[PDB]
Design an enzyme around this catalytic site. Structure first.
Site, PDB file in Angstrom:
ATOM      1  N   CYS A  46       0.873  -1.183   0.000  1.00 17.83           N
ATOM      2  CA  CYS A  46       0.000   0.000   0.000  1.00 17.83           C
ATOM      3  C   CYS A  46       0.911   1.234   0.000  1.00 17.83           C
ATOM      4  CB  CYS A  46      -0.974   0.026   1.214  1.00 17.83           C
ATOM      5  SG  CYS A  46      -2.069   1.519   1.455  1.00 17.83           S
ATOM      6  N   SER A  48       0.593   3.785   1.733  1.00 19.03           N
ATOM      7  CA  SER A  48       0.865   4.209   3.123  1.00 19.03           C
ATOM      8  C   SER A  48       2.136   3.545   3.722  1.00 19.03           C
ATOM      9  CB  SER A  48      -0.294   3.940   4.051  1.00 19.03           C
ATOM     10  OG  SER A  48      -1.431   4.677   3.656  1.00 19.03           O
ATOM     11  N   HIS A  67       0.407  -3.461   6.647  1.00 21.81           N
ATOM     12  CA  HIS A  67      -0.909  -3.346   7.287  1.00 21.81           C
ATOM     13  C   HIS A  67      -2.059  -3.940   6.484  1.00 21.81           C
ATOM     14  CE1 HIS A  67      -0.696   0.195   4.697  1.00 21.81           C
ATOM     15  NE2 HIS A  67      -2.018   0.272   4.749  1.00 21.81           N
TER      16      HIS A  67
HETATM   17  N1  LIG Z   1      -7.729   7.026   4.466  1.00 21.71           N
HETATM   18  C1  LIG Z   1      -7.264   5.727   4.513  1.00 21.71           C
HETATM   19  O1  LIG Z   1      -7.715   4.983   5.373  1.00 21.71           O
HETATM   20  C2  LIG Z   1      -6.229   5.337   3.585  1.00 21.71           C
HETATM   21  C3  LIG Z   1      -6.069   3.890   3.331  1.00 21.71           C
HETATM   22  C4  LIG Z   1      -5.278   3.567   2.205  1.00 21.71           C
HETATM   23  C5  LIG Z   1      -4.561   4.467   1.557  1.00 21.71           C
HETATM   24  N2  LIG Z   1      -4.541   5.839   1.958  1.00 21.71           N
HETATM   25  C6  LIG Z   1      -3.851   6.841   1.189  1.00 21.71           C
HETATM   26  O2  LIG Z   1      -4.492   6.990  -0.090  1.00 21.71           O
HETATM   27  C7  LIG Z   1      -3.540   7.441  -1.048  1.00 21.71           C
HETATM   28  C8  LIG Z   1      -3.607   6.586  -2.287  1.00 21.71           C
HETATM   29  O3  LIG Z   1      -3.077   5.295  -1.991  1.00 21.71           O
HETATM   30  P1  LIG Z   1      -2.820   4.277  -3.194  1.00 21.71           P
HETATM   31  O4  LIG Z   1      -3.997   4.233  -4.115  1.00 21.71           O
HETATM   32  O5  LIG Z   1      -2.274   2.992  -2.549  1.00 21.71           O
HETATM   33  O6  LIG Z   1      -1.643   5.074  -3.912  1.00 21.71           O
HETATM   34  P2  LIG Z   1      -1.032   5.007  -5.368  1.00 21.71           P
HETATM   35  O7  LIG Z   1      -1.195   3.607  -5.934  1.00 21.71           O
HETATM   36  O8  LIG Z   1       0.320   5.637  -5.295  1.00 21.71           O
HETATM   37  O9  LIG Z   1      -1.979   5.953  -6.259  1.00 21.71           O
HETATM   38  C9  LIG Z   1      -1.865   7.383  -6.249  1.00 21.71           C
HETATM   39  C10 LIG Z   1      -2.209   7.902  -7.631  1.00 21.71           C
HETATM   40  O10 LIG Z   1      -2.125   9.333  -7.552  1.00 21.71           O
HETATM   41  C11 LIG Z   1      -1.608   9.796  -8.803  1.00 21.71           C
HETATM   42  N3  LIG Z   1      -1.109  11.177  -8.648  1.00 21.71           N
HETATM   43  C12 LIG Z   1       0.019  11.608  -8.096  1.00 21.71           C
HETATM   44  N4  LIG Z   1       0.066  12.926  -8.147  1.00 21.71           N
HETATM   45  C13 LIG Z   1      -1.103  13.370  -8.745  1.00 21.71           C
HETATM   46  C14 LIG Z   1      -1.657  14.641  -9.101  1.00 21.71           C
HETATM   47  N5  LIG Z   1      -1.007  15.758  -8.814  1.00 21.71           N
HETATM   48  N6  LIG Z   1      -2.842  14.651  -9.687  1.00 21.71           N
HETATM   49  C15 LIG Z   1      -3.535  13.561  -9.964  1.00 21.71           C
HETATM   50  N7  LIG Z   1      -3.042  12.310  -9.713  1.00 21.71           N
HETATM   51  C16 LIG Z   1      -1.842  12.247  -9.062  1.00 21.71           C
HETATM   52  C17 LIG Z   1      -0.526   8.794  -9.159  1.00 21.71           C
HETATM   53  O11 LIG Z   1      -0.137   8.827 -10.537  1.00 21.71           O
HETATM   54  C18 LIG Z   1      -1.189   7.473  -8.703  1.00 21.71           C
HETATM   55  O12 LIG Z   1      -1.818   6.761  -9.747  1.00 21.71           O
HETATM   56  C19 LIG Z   1      -2.173   7.470  -0.303  1.00 21.71           C
HETATM   57  O13 LIG Z   1      -1.891   8.778   0.183  1.00 21.71           O
HETATM   58  C20 LIG Z   1      -2.415   6.534   0.843  1.00 21.71           C
HETATM   59  O14 LIG Z   1      -1.489   6.750   1.908  1.00 21.71           O
HETATM   60  C21 LIG Z   1      -5.466   6.211   2.931  1.00 21.71           C
HETATM   61  O1  LIG Z   2      -3.317   3.041   4.276  1.00 17.67           O
HETATM   62  C1  LIG Z   2      -3.873   3.205   5.588  1.00 17.67           C
HETATM   63  C2  LIG Z   2      -3.238   4.235   6.473  1.00 17.67           C
HETATM   64  C3  LIG Z   2      -3.830   5.456   6.798  1.00 17.67           C
HETATM   65  F1  LIG Z   2      -4.975   5.852   6.260  1.00 17.67           F
HETATM   66  C4  LIG Z   2      -3.208   6.361   7.551  1.00 17.67           C
HETATM   67  F2  LIG Z   2      -3.791   7.531   7.852  1.00 17.67           F
HETATM   68  C5  LIG Z   2      -2.015   6.025   8.161  1.00 17.67           C
HETATM   69  F3  LIG Z   2      -1.433   6.920   8.961  1.00 17.67           F
HETATM   70  C6  LIG Z   2      -1.429   4.833   7.872  1.00 17.67           C
HETATM   71  F4  LIG Z   2      -0.240   4.487   8.429  1.00 17.67           F
HETATM   72  C7  LIG Z   2      -2.053   3.928   7.053  1.00 17.67           C
HETATM   73  F5  LIG Z   2      -1.449   2.728   6.807  1.00 17.67           F
HETATM   74 ZN   LIG Z   3      -3.248   1.285   3.446  1.00 16.66          ZN
END
Ligand SMILES: NC(=O)c1ccc[n+]([C@@H]2O[C@H](COP(=O)([O-])OP(=O)([O-])OC[C@H]3O[C@@H](n4cnc5c(N)[nH+]cnc54)[C@H](O)[C@@H]3O)[C@@H](O)[C@H]2O)c1
Ligand SMILES: OCc1c(F)c(F)c(F)c(F)c1F
Ligand SMILES: [Zn+2]
Ligand SMILES: NC(=O)c1ccc[n+]([C@@H]2O[C@H](COP(=O)([O-])OP(=O)([O-])OC[C@H]3O[C@@H](n4cnc5c(N)[nH+]cnc54)[C@H](O)[C@@H]3O)[C@@H](O)[C@H]2O)c1
Ligand SMILES: OCc1c(F)c(F)c(F)c(F)c1F
Ligand SMILES: [Zn+2]
Ligand SMILES: [Zn+2]
Ligand SMILES: [Zn+2]
Lengths: 374, 374
Positions: A46, A48, A67
């Protein structure tokens, strides 16, 4: 038998930021009261987890990250009632203690026992089950899934269907449930609506899946990497746009496309600028914008509150808003009943020993999810 | 006898920021098609009118301000179907055209014909009905109620009960409905909840009324002027706090008082810092914070989006979220049936000619609402 004994096994230890994982032997203590030791079967990479490597997320080091995973219970400590040795389980990075004010609330899921807000990198008892080269190693989010064996608190584990394919359902431990729930539970996307999804990685794809499941009429994917567009369309995006193709800011583009703003927008990247853009592109009187992405530690965004005074709603959530221990087993049951697909999210399956190569695929833009198999 | 003719009357013209109003003769043109000319009976002095004077709220000058009022229709233009001469009416600073995407939306109220987002200070046709000293004078929010006679678009007026006491129900044109609706409609305050209300002026008192009506168990009023606390408790606050009494930031105090954050918070002042404080003090997983106050023009706030990522909801609204033309007559009907009280908001009455004294009372902190009579 391993029960009651220290296990020596392989794990991926992160000794310092911005370095590769070190794949080496660790000692895993047996579970104490109300703890569960799990033999890992599959874990996802992931973004994160990469945030820990990059310093975007601050958590105590050295650490065993990971995780998003699934495995099989090896042993249980005294007093455990919800899982037994041999059960298939998913670790819960958001726990569900069932007793705190959040757990008791009909709409809260960010249990107060979490180790996200102010991470200690320990078990609930403030100690670690891991040693490496004689040194204590931190846990991560109470899960630490980049190890052949982990120990988790009971409130951080859910029993799942014994017939579950663990190399797929590990995604229910984070990326699928987060995106899907962000759409269906947190935003509560409506039938016939227009949605905008910023970021088309594993989580953003799952947001698309949920918007489609909710009956959205239009789902606009936004990403700077146009290689992400084909899969976004496969899972439901009606249009995709690359901000780099436009002379104007993308919020203006999206407002024009949607004849005055979208119904629902989602930030699924982790950038402060895209969080404000996503809010701005939702309709000013009734739009809803959900922050899903995790931004760099301790950085503030700047925004004009007139964006909200006109009527917009701005929200965020962890894990799709799902109460974790109640929801994970039901999500797996729904997957088994073919209510959603996980294969579109899985682009690579590698042995655990190739964890670094898996992170390089993510960083290069080449993967959605790599699943590591133990 | 005045139908179709220019009316010469007295109005309070604001020629320049940071100056007193000038009560002097103006010429009020007859209504064009789909316009209504109204003889004003009573108008309230709202802090947003003061914002025009201070430059907090930018709108073209010179202007006839005023937006919280009630009067009697003097004449109607061609094609008007919803009011007649002699009807009691409330001007609607947020219009309801009934035709735009917002007006058709079940939740939305910020009609796209509004003159708030990018004020022109005109009628819907881009012209003015007011002349003073031979010079055109701007309208304000399509209402301009600081005049013995005004002209408004039909979409900016509601007919109300013929037996209505206009010196009371003018408050339904802004301060009451905004605060009450912010609690009951926008936040959707729940029975048994804990609410925090920042700012105990007329609007914040109305928020308290709404929170009490919705069944909140605790309603904490926050104001730096302790003279505001007695009336806040009379209308339902369970306790009041003055930030100036504490060494710790008030968000910390409120989080402690509410054993981990409040269910609902409301910013009813107009300051960027209190908007962030109000968000922070709601419970991190399931709290809701509503921005009601109007902040200084073109200024951005700074905030950490982790406040939202944990689960908070942040929203704002104009006019309590009420669709104006549908809602105003119902609110008056409910007032006439004693479903809510307006007298607690009215602290002073003055003739229109004493408008400047009315503003002095608001600026000194002494009044809640002064009602001006024509
Ligand atoms: N809230 C939660 O519980 C939670 C859980 C899982 C992931 N996250 C977060 O969610 C985000 C996405 O995770 P992911 O899908 O595994 O990441 P990922 O696979 O890196 O996807 C991110 C996407 O964003 C694109 N990107 C980067 N910069 C830009 C921009 N300026 N404009 C438009 N697109 C852009 C990039 O090309 C990529 O396809 C990360 O910040 C994680 O840490 C949060
Ligand atoms: O991807 C899930 C995820 C979150 F959404 C967070 F906010 C964080 F701090 C973290 F460690 C994490 F794993
Ligand atoms: Zn995650
Ligand atoms: N959203 C809308 O539709 C809408 C409609 C009506 C009014 N407004 C705005 O709502 C706000 C309140 O209007 P009002 O009730 O007529 O104004 P008011 O009577 O001036 O009340 C504001 C209160 O805030 C108090 N206050 C000032 N600074 C602080 C501080 N730092 N901490 C705590 N209390 C403080 C002050 O003492 C006063 O009692 C103003 O900004 C209005 O412009 C918005
Ligand atoms: O008091 C109501 C009110 C508002 F809420 C505004 F946002 C605004 F710009 C304005 F002029 C006004 F009068
Ligand atoms: Zn809990
Ligand atoms: Zn409209
Ligand atoms: Zn007002």
């Amino acid at each position: 038998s391993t029960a009651g004994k220290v296990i020596k096994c392989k794990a991926a230890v992160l000794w310092e930021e911005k370095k590769p994982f070190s794949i080496e032997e660790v000692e895993v203590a047996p579970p104490k009261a109300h703890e569960v030791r799990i033999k890992m079967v599959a874990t996802g990479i992931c973004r994160s987890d990469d945030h820990v490597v990059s310093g975007t997320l601050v958590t105590p080091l050295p650490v065993i990250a990971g995780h998003e995973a699934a495995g099989i219970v090896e042993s249980i400590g005294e007093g455990v009632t919800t899982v037994r040795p041999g059960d298939k389980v998913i670790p819960l990075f958001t726990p569900q203690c069932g007793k705190c004010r959040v757990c008791k609330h009909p709409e809260g899921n960010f249990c107060l026992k979490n180790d996200l807000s102010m991470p200690r990198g320990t078990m609930q008892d403030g100690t670690s089950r891991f040693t490496c080269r004689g040194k204590p190693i931190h846990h991560f989010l109470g899960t630490s899934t980049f190890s052949q064996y982990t120990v988790v608190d009971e409130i951080s584990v859910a029993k799942i269907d014994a017939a579950s394919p663990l190399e797929k359902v590990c995604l229910i431990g984070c990326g699928f449930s987060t995106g899907y729930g962000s759409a269906v539970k947190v935003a509560k996307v409506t039938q016939g609506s227009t949605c905008a999804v910023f970021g088309l990685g594993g989580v953003g794809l799952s947001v698309i899946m949920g918007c489609k499941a909710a009956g959205a009429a239009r789902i606009i994917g936004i990403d700077i990497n146009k290689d992400k567009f084909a899969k976004a369309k496969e899972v439901g995006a009606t249009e995709c746009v690359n901000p780099q193709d436009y002379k104007k800011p993308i919020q203006e583009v999206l407002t024009e496309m949607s004849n005055g703003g979208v119904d629902f927008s989602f930030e699924v990247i982790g950038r402060l600028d895209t969080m404000v853009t996503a809010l701005s592109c939702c309709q000013e009187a009734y739009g809803v914008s959900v922050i899903v992405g995790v931004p760099p530690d301790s950085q503030n965004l700047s925004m004009n509150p007139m964006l909200l005074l006109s009527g917009r709603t701005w929200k965020g959530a962890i894990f799709g808003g799902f109460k974790s221990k109640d929801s994970v087993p039901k999500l797996v049951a729904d997957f088994m009943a073919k209510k959603f697909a996980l294969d579109p999210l899985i682009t690579h399956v590698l042995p655990f020993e190739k964890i670094n190569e898996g992170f390089d695929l993510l960083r290069s833009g080449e993967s959605i999810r790599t699943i590591l198999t133990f």
